[PDB]
Amino acid sequence: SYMLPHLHNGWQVDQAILSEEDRVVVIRFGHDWDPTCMKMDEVLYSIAEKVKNFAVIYLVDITEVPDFNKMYELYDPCTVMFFFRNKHIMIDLGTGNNNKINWAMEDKQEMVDIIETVYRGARKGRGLVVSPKDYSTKYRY
Amino acid sequence: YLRKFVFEWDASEDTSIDYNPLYKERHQVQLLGRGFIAGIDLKQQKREQ
Amino acid sequence: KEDMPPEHVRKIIRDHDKRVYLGALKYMPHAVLKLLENMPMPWEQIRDVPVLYHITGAISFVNEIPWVIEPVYISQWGSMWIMMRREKRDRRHFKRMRFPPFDDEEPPLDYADNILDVEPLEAIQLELDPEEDAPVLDWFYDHQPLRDSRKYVNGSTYQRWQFTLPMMSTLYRLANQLLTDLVDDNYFYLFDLKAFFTSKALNMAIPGGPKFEPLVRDINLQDEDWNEFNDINKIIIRQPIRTEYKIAFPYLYNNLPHHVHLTWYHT
Amino acid sequence: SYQKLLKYYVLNALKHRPPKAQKKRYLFRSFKATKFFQSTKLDWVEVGLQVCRQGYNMLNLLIHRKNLNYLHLDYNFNLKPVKTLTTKERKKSRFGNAFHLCREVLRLTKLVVDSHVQYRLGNVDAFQLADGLQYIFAHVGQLTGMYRYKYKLMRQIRMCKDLKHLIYYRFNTGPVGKGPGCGFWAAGWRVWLFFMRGITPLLERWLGNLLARSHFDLELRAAVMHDILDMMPEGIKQNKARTILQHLSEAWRCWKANIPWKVPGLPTPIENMILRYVKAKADWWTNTAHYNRERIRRGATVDKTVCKKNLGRL
Amino acid sequence: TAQCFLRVDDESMQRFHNRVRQILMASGSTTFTKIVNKWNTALIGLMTYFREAVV
Amino acid sequence: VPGLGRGATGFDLNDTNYDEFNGYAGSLFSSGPYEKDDEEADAIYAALDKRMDERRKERREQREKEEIEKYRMERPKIQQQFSDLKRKLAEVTEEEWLSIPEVGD
Amino acid sequence: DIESSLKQLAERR
Amino acid sequence: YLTEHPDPNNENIVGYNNKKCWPRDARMRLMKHDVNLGRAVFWDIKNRLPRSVTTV
Amino acid sequence: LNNIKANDYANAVLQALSNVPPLRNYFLEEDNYKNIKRPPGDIMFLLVQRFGELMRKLWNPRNFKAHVSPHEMLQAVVLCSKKTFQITKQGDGVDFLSWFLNALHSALGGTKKKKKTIVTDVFQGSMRIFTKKLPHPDLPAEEKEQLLHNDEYQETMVESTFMYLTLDLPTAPLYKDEKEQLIIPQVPLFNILAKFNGITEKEYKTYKENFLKRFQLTKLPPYLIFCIKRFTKNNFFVEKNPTIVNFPITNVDLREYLSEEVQAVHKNTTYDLIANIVHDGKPSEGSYRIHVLHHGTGKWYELQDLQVTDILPQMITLSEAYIQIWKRR
């Protein structure tokens, strides 16, 4: 399915990041067949219209669009990238690297909170924002 | 009735820790005084027989 | 085809369509395995071998297989045992010089430069007394003892051997250090393969024997609920029923004998 | 050591299966039949040195083909970097366990051949050569980093050490005491050749490849969507895909609520496909709910989302 | 005339373990104070109910 | 325009392309100086590989066919299960497609 | 649009 | 009980519930007479209750 | 019948085979089967004699107790089935009935396959299978019609003998109907008895092959056995079909399911339900009960192990019928 819009070349990506001025651009780098990307894209579609006011989601295929692999260290099976007014926003998830999510959370509310915090920090002017949760521990007991 | 690459085995893996005297001190083979266990020095076997 | 002069492969490997070279490189683990399995024995100084080498020098296999007559091989290694023990008793200051690296990072010595013209110092061959080792002293320390003799082996393939009894007696004498001189399997009572299988299938370890993970899931003896069958008030105890008793008679001292092999009785 | 040697002997004798019928194809006869190979007669030390050189050259070719000029491999097959690696370079340097295993195999071959050439030069005695071979075959793990790349190899190593305990304590009886003079390398050489037999096809397959030329509901939904949109007029599928997806979600919700679901304008083939999809997803849903409840009740580690979802499903 | 040996039923032990697991998972972003309060309440209930049987 | 046309700077090595065994997937010599001699060498080595596989080719292929047939018969792929309804769905007029309602009722 | 991604997914799976 | 539910194989012991928490010498010991008596008591109690009203 | 652990299915099947006048009468006399020859190392005959013994215990006018232990019969069943249909673990009623009827038919044939045994004389009938092979659906229509001239994808003559009729219930309606009716589906008996009308074409698809098995009855046995298919294995577990069969219990005319040349042969086709095995509960922890019509009187009795209740004639159709035995009169 994947009703979320897709970008088929680097040109689409680099004018999609600059297209939004009052909304956070979300880019999922990965592959549809990849299950983890499947989980994240299901979560995103579950909240695609909830964050329409202040966020936008685009799906980018690594094979179709491989130019960002070296610059963004796109070596994981899947990454999630946050941009605002041409500036990347780093998120302090507690996983060691603040640039990309690199994992698929099943709860859509966690992603909603993450994108809301990113928007709040980007409109205020901070380039690095703190996640309102710690993902170092999976919280499984 | 009621990880770690370990090159050498652990001493707890040992067996033959018996309580019966018949099984702890087992009467060795004396092959008519003319047969010897392989590998061991022949002179040592002759002395300790 | 026919064998070529050894200088041809020497020149080829000295001087060095990449597809042929890359395809030849694929079978390298066979090259390693055939080199290592044709490893010279301690009693041999030089062991010439047939070699199938790539025309581009990308690879070279040792073609032959280490065929050795079992009694002769065991006797040779028993003589090696004797000589090694004698030398270690002689040399109090034996110095190990085995080298884990190939001359470290140093380039591989050129065989035609410093190994070709150097003759070996000596071998580890045991000295054989001509009065007792008469039938074997002629060939006891050859690369293949009787390969060229039609009477003792089938032929150059070196696949069948027949020996006269004096030769086998001398070989048995020379290999007495590697044999326990047992004349029975009674020494292996409750200690042979079938006994070990019975022990493993019953999740029990012979004292001298090994120990294995349980073959089937074992229920703790504290789980049984004191039936009339296993009532301890009825059981008469004289001696502790050992693991050996249960292995010797698996169908009598075990309540669930499964995949148990009956051990051979007295011979 | 005796007990573990018996354990492995019993394991070999019990896990043993009779060999299976073949067609008797010989690799080296086929190699000789081609033009690329030629036969000769060579000294074992010479072919050992030649094999070491060829292995070093082939490893150099494999390293340089990836353009990994920042990693240098010496003649003892010890690969080391020359500079601090970038993350891109570090990922490029991930050769896998196969390459490292082959490199350490070539290092062991280099060790054996180097000991033999050392004996042939005359620097060490033949007794020293045999003792060095025994040490090499009894201390592969120490002399060569093999266990990390293949964990099972560790077992073989213990064998060798066990075999040492089998030989030394028989070799060192009587006048001979503890010392570095015991050369008896049949057992370890046997063990490492038997390991090489097993690992030869793996490294050959790796080299041939390198030198050539849960979420059932989501997949079910994607597959049914693909099947429906294939049998879809091209000019009408712009919004009808979204409409039928909304219909699928509504049908799933209606089944989850025990309420009738009967779209009047929906054609009966599409309706029957939706019914089949809902049936399959409901079967998977019920089965996974029961499985998750069993897992949670048993005591398995689970997070909040799983428990919450399970409770809802239950 | 008799001794009544007491124990805690394995069902009650499993209930206590499940309560502890629920406290641990339902913690999330809650203050450590409330987590410790929940653990204290569970422990107090268990001990005040199973006084001798716990020992 | 490249990816730098956005004016951005960084802050197949993908884990997917890498396997602990065999390392990274993909032949390192996929393209290069390929000519008639290279084709001949590849043909010879492929023939050698086929000859090696001939040792147990008949029984191995028979067992593989039986195993895959039984696996497909026991567990059918979801596309196979829905192919019947997919093909029965072809018989529909294009006028009925516009008639598909929403879920507002 | 959706069919373009569905064909890519089916081909890759 | 055995007139109504005969047990020729002494199978009454196979499904007897016992408190595994206690050690073996502390649990109930499944003697033939004791097992039969327990089953008989439970059977009588169950028969006293109609099945539709409640089940034991 | 006493319930030795989980053997309620076997008790239900045995009670269904009992209360059948011809088979029961055959097994009530020991001389009818004692003198037939057996192979030396044959254990199947233990099924026969003990079964007869069981009958004589069930129909005893003067008995010391109002119940019979099936222990010996079930031990014979376990021994003869090679650890299948155990006494401890309950099995499918349909499968056990099929195996038991086949074993009785085989064992009553002395040292040879007697073509006419009491089992065949009572329960076996003749049915005409019209197997029509089908082309693969993923073919062009022109090739699809061209394969119609292959003479392979047409009706065949595979007429055989059926010991029981396997009726397949329609799938559960999933979503409940908007009507006030219960969520439990209801289907008439004649609707499931439509695959054997002759024109109905149920699809049959094995691996990479398609069929259309048309069925037409040709000989109606004196006692007809319906094996309604409840338990079906889906992709993950086994689901028991909750469909309720709406059947009459005093008059069923099958004249419309027989060929015209066949209808003339049988003067009687009016069947009365005499036995009804019903499965209750989940597919795993299910229980078996039986509704039996006591002749002489008109009362209907529900037997479940040692429980004998007087059921009303109207309430039988409400329960999920699993196996049915009808008498042709």
In a domain, A105, yes or no: yes
Q: Which residue's entry shows tokens 């390693």?
A: C32
Indicate which of G1, G2, G5 best probes the interface with D, i.e. most D CBs within 10 Å of its own CB.
G2
- Sign of the C-alpha dihedral computed for residues D12, D13, D19 and D25 taken in this order: positive
E26 CB-near residues (< 8 Å, 6+ apart)? D304
**CA–CA distance, A140 with D303 (Å, rounded to integer):** 4
Please give the structure tokens belonging to residue I130. 């019209």
Residue F32: DSSP 8-state: S
Other CB atoms closer than 10 Å to residue D294's CB: what's the count? 10
- Coil/strand/helix, residue H48: helix
Residues G9, A3: C-beta atoms closer than 8 Å: no
Instruction: Tell me, yes or no, if H46 comes closer than 8 A to chain C by beta carbon.
Output: no
Please give the structure tokens belonging to residue I283. 């597919």
Please give the structure tokens belonging to residue H36. 């039969």
Please give the structure tokens belonging to residue D267. 């054609």
Question: Where on the phi/psi map is residue I238: left (φ > 0), alpha (ψ -120 to 50), or beta?
Answer: beta
The residue in chain C having the minimum alpha-carbon distance to the alpha carbon of residue H33 is C228
Q: Which of D208, D211, D243 is CA-nearest to residue D225? A: D243
**CA–CA distance, I269 with C265 (Å, rounded to integer):** 73
Per the DSSP assignment, residues forming a β-bridge with I225 are I325
Contact I120, I107 (CB under 8 A): no
Q: Which residue's entry shows tokens 């700077």?
A: F9
Contact A98, A118 (CB under 8 A): no
Contact C174, C139 (CB under 8 A): no
H/E element, E53: helix E51-54
Instruction: Tell me, yes or no, if C230 comes closer than 8 A to chain H by beta carbon.
Output: no
Please give the structure tokens belonging to residue D106. 């070539």
Q: Which of I209, I54, I22 is CA-nearest to residue I134? A: I209
CATH number of the domain at A73, please.
3.40.30.10
CA distances from H7 to D255, H14, H17, I4 (A): 49, 12, 18, 8
* CB–CB contacts below 8 A, D to I: 31
- Coil/strand/helix, residue I220: coil
Burial F43-70 (b: 16+ CB within 10 A, else e): ebbeebeebeeebeeeeeeeeeeeeeee
Q: Which residue's entry shows tokens 């799976």?
A: G13
Alpha helices in I113-156 (DSSP H): 118-123, 141-146
CA distances from D155 to D101, D151, D266, I139 (A): 15, 8, 65, 57
Please give the structure tokens belonging to residue D138. 């009894």
Indicate which of D221, D226, D231, D236 best probes the interface with G, i.e. most G CBs within 10 Å of its own CB.
D226
* CB–CB contacts below 8 A, A to E: 9
**CA–CA distance, C154 with C132 (Å, rounded to integer):** 27
- Coil/strand/helix, residue I238: strand
Backbone φ and ψ of I240, nearest 5°: -95, 125
Please give the structure tokens belonging to residue I132. 């029509």
Q: Which of A57, A93, D123, D213 is CA-nearest to residue C115? A: D123
Instruction: Tell me, yes or no, if H16 comes closer than 8 A to chain C by beta carbon.
Output: yes
Residues H13, C227: C-beta atoms closer than 8 Å: yes
Q: Which of B4, I313, B37 is CA-nearest to residue C176? A: B37
In a domain, A102, yes or no: yes
Dihedral angle computed from the Cα positions of residues E7, E12, E17 and E20, in that order, rounded to the nearest 10 degrees: -110
Backbone φ and ψ of A129, nearest 5°: -125, 155
How far is Cα of residue B49 from the mean position of the Cα atoms in its chain? 15
Instruction: Tell me, yes or no, if A2 comes closer than 8 A to chain G by beta carbon.
Output: yes
In a domain, A122, yes or no: yes
**CA–CA distance, C190 with C202 (Å, rounded to integer):** 14
**CA–CA distance, F101 with H5 (Å, rounded to integer):** 64
C50 CB-near residues (< 8 Å, 6+ apart)? C3, C62, C63, C64, D39, D40, D41
CA distances from D142 to B6, D5, D137, D190, I188 (A): 12, 21, 10, 18, 81
Q: Which residues of E touch H26 (CB under 8 A)?
A: 5
F68 CB-near residues (< 8 Å, 6+ apart)? none
Q: What radius of gyration do chain I's Cα atoms show?
A: 21
B32 CB-near residues (< 8 Å, 6+ apart)? none
CA distances from H54 to D152, H49, H51, I2, I310 (A): 60, 7, 5, 22, 20
Residues D283, I235: C-beta atoms closer than 8 Å: yes
**CA–CA distance, H16 with C223 (Å, rounded to integer):** 13
Contact D132, C94 (CB under 8 A): no
Contact D45, C111 (CB under 8 A): yes
- Sign of the C-alpha dihedral computed for residues B37, B39, B43 and B48 taken in this order: negative
In a domain, A141, yes or no: no
B49 CB-near residues (< 8 Å, 6+ apart)? B30, B33
Contact D185, D163 (CB under 8 A): no
Residues B15, C235: C-beta atoms closer than 8 Å: no
The distance in angstroms from the start CA to the end CA of chain H is: 17
I174 vs D279, D284, D286: nearest CB: D279
CA distances from A22 to A17, A87, A119, A129 (A): 11, 13, 9, 17
Contact D174, B43 (CB under 8 A): yes
Q: Packing angle between helix D186-210 and helix D153-171, nearest 10 degrees? A: 160
Task: Report the number of secondary-structure helices (H) and strands (E) in chain E.
Answer: 3, 0
C164 CB-near residues (< 8 Å, 6+ apart)? C135
Strands D79-81 and D71-73 turn out to be: antiparallel
* CB–CB contacts below 8 A, B to C: 48
Q: Which of C17, I99, D108 is CA-nearest to residue F32? A: C17
Burial I179-211 (b: 16+ CB within 10 A, else e): eeeeeebeeebbebbbbbebeeeeeeeeeeeeb
CA distances from G8 to A67, D120, D198, D233, G13 (A): 20, 64, 40, 19, 9
Long-range pairs of I151-158 with CB within 8 A, sequence gap ≥ 24? I155/I130, I155/I131, I155/I214, I156/I129, I156/I130, I156/I131, I156/I132, I157/I128, I158/I129, I158/I130, I158/I131
CA distances from D132 to D119, D126, D186, F94 (A): 10, 10, 13, 85
Backbone φ and ψ of F56, nearest 5°: -130, 25
I2 CB-near residues (< 8 Å, 6+ apart)? H5, H6, I67, I68, I69, I70, I71, I305, I306
E strands along chain I, which residues?
125-134, 160-162, 165-168, 186-188, 202-204, 210-219, 223-229, 231-233, 238-240, 244-246, 252-253, 270-280, 287-293, 300-304, 307-311, 321-327
I126 CB-near residues (< 8 Å, 6+ apart)? I159, I160, I161, I162, I217, I218, I219
Q: Which residues of D touch F96 (CB under 8 A)?
A: 267
Q: What radius of gyration do chain C's Cα atoms show?
A: 29
Instruction: Tell me, yes or no, if E32 comes closer than 8 A to chain A by beta carbon.
Output: no
D244 CB-near residues (< 8 Å, 6+ apart)? D228, D270, F100
**At residue D296, what is the residue type?**
I
Alpha helices in chain I (DSSP H): 8-17, 21-28, 31-34, 45-58, 71-80, 93-107, 118-123, 141-146, 189-192, 260-263
I317 CB-near residues (< 8 Å, 6+ apart)? I244, I245, I246, I247, I248, I249
Backbone φ and ψ of I280, nearest 5°: -120, 150
Question: Where on the phi/psi map is residue I54: left (φ > 0), alpha (ψ -120 to 50), or beta?
Answer: alpha
Strands D71-73 and D37-43 turn out to be: unpaired
Other CB atoms closer than 10 Å to residue C121's CB: what's the count? 15
In a domain, A123, yes or no: yes
Burial B7-23 (b: 16+ CB within 10 A, else e): eeeeeeeebeeeeeeee
Per residue, the 3-state secondary structure of chain C, as one string, reads CCCECHHHHHHHHHHCCHHHHHHHHHHHHHHHHHHHHCCCCCCCCCCEEEEEEECCCCCEEECCCCCCCHHHHHHHHHHHHHHHHHHHHHCCCCCCCCCCCCCCCCCCCCHHHHCCCCCCCCCCCCCCCCCCCCCCCCCCCCCCCCCCCCCCECCCCCCCECCCHHHHHHHHHHCHHHCCCCCCCHHHCCCCHHHHHHHHHCCCCCCCCCCCCCCCCCCCCCCCCCCCCCCCCCCCCCCCCCHHHHHHCCCCCCCCCCCCCCCCCCC
Please give the structure tokens belonging to residue C17. 């369509």
**CA–CA distance, D130 with A56 (Å, rounded to integer):** 73
Q: How many CA atoms lie within 13 A of D255 on its CB side?
A: 21
CA angle I118, I119, I124 (to 5 degrees): 120
Please give the structure tokens belonging to residue D11. 């394991």
**CA–CA distance, I97 with I17 (Å, rounded to integer):** 9
> Which subunits count as partners of chain A given 3+ CB pairs below 8 Å?
D, E, F, G
User: If contacts are CB pairs under 8 Å, which of residues 56-85 in chain D contact chain A?
Assistant: none
Contact D277, D226 (CB under 8 A): no
Please give the structure tokens belonging to residue D293. 């409840």
Residues H4, I67: C-beta atoms closer than 8 Å: yes
I69 vs H6, H15, H51: nearest CB: H6
Indicate which of H2, H11, H14, H51 best probes the interface with I, i.e. most I CBs within 10 Å of its own CB.
H11
Indicate which of I1, I3, I4, I307 best probes the interface with H, i.e. most H CBs within 10 Å of its own CB.
I4
Per residue, the 3-state secondary structure of chain D, as one string, reads CHHHHHHHHHHHHHCCCCCCCCCCCCHHHHHHHCCCEEEEEEEHHHHHHHHHHHHHHHHHHHHHHCCCCCEEECCCCCEEECCCCCHHHHHHCCCHHHHHHHHHHHHHHHHHHHHHHHHHHCCCCHHHHHHHHHHHHHCHHHHCCCCCCCCCHHHHHHHHHHHHHHHHHHHCCCCCCCCCCCCCCHHHHHHHHHHHHHHHHHHHHHHHHHCCCCCHHHHHHHHHHHHHHHCCCCCCHHHHHHHHHHHHHHHHHHHHCCCCCCCCCCCHHHHHHHHHHHHHHHHHHHHHHHHHHHHHHHCCCCCHHHHHHHHHHC
Contact A139, E28 (CB under 8 A): yes
In a domain, A7, yes or no: yes
**At residue C51, what is the residue type?**
V
Domain total for chain A?
A: 1
What burial class does residue C160 get, using C-beta atoms within 10 Å of its C-beta: 0-12 exposed, 13-18 middle, 19+ buried? exposed
Please give the structure tokens belonging to residue D215. 């979420």
Residues I236, D283: C-beta atoms closer than 8 Å: yes
**CA–CA distance, H34 with C127 (Å, rounded to integer):** 84
Contact I214, I201 (CB under 8 A): yes
Contact I70, I54 (CB under 8 A): yes
**CA–CA distance, I313 with H54 (Å, rounded to integer):** 26
What burial class does residue D263 get, using C-beta atoms within 10 Å of its C-beta: 0-12 exposed, 13-18 middle, 19+ buried? middle
Range of the domain at A14: 2-136
Residues C210, D78: C-beta atoms closer than 8 Å: no
In a domain, A91, yes or no: yes
Touch between chain H and chain D: 3 or more Cβ pairs under 8 Å:
no
H/E element, A82: strand A79-84
Q: How many CA atoms lie within 13 A of C181 on its CB side?
A: 17
What burial class does residue A37 get, using C-beta atoms within 10 Å of its C-beta: 0-12 exposed, 13-18 middle, 19+ buried? buried
Other CB atoms closer than 10 Å to residue H3's CB: what's the count? 8
**E24 to chain A, closest Cα gap in Å:** 7
Residue F4: DSSP 8-state: G
Q: What radius of gyration do chain G's Cα atoms show?
A: 6
Q: Which of I212, I133, I208 is CA-nearest to residue F70? A: I208
Strands A24-30 and A55-61 turn out to be: parallel
Q: Which residues of F touch D243 (CB under 8 A)?
A: 100, 102
**At residue H24, what is the residue type?**
R
Dihedral angle computed from the Cα positions of residues F54, F59, F64 and F69, in that order, rounded to the nearest 10 degrees: 140
| Reported resolution, Å | 9.6
Long-range pairs of C153-162 with CB within 8 A, sequence gap ≥ 24? C158/C67, C159/C67, C161/C69
**At residue C126, what is the residue type?**
L
Residues I137, F84: C-beta atoms closer than 8 Å: yes
In a domain, A27, yes or no: yes
Strands I270-280 and I287-293 turn out to be: antiparallel
**CA–CA distance, I21 with I296 (Å, rounded to integer):** 12
**CA–CA distance, I42 with I109 (Å, rounded to integer):** 12
Residue F6: DSSP 8-state: G
Per the DSSP assignment, residues forming a β-bridge with I233 are I238
Q: Which residue's entry shows tokens 């895959």?
A: F68
**CA–CA distance, D6 with D23 (Å, rounded to integer):** 35
Contact D241, F100 (CB under 8 A): no
Q: What radius of gyration do chain B's Cα atoms show?
A: 18
**CA–CA distance, I122 with I120 (Å, rounded to integer):** 5
Residues D270, F89: C-beta atoms closer than 8 Å: yes
Q: Which residues of D touch I234 (CB under 8 A)?
A: 283
**CA–CA distance, I200 with I190 (Å, rounded to integer):** 13
Per the DSSP assignment, residues forming a β-bridge with I216 are I128
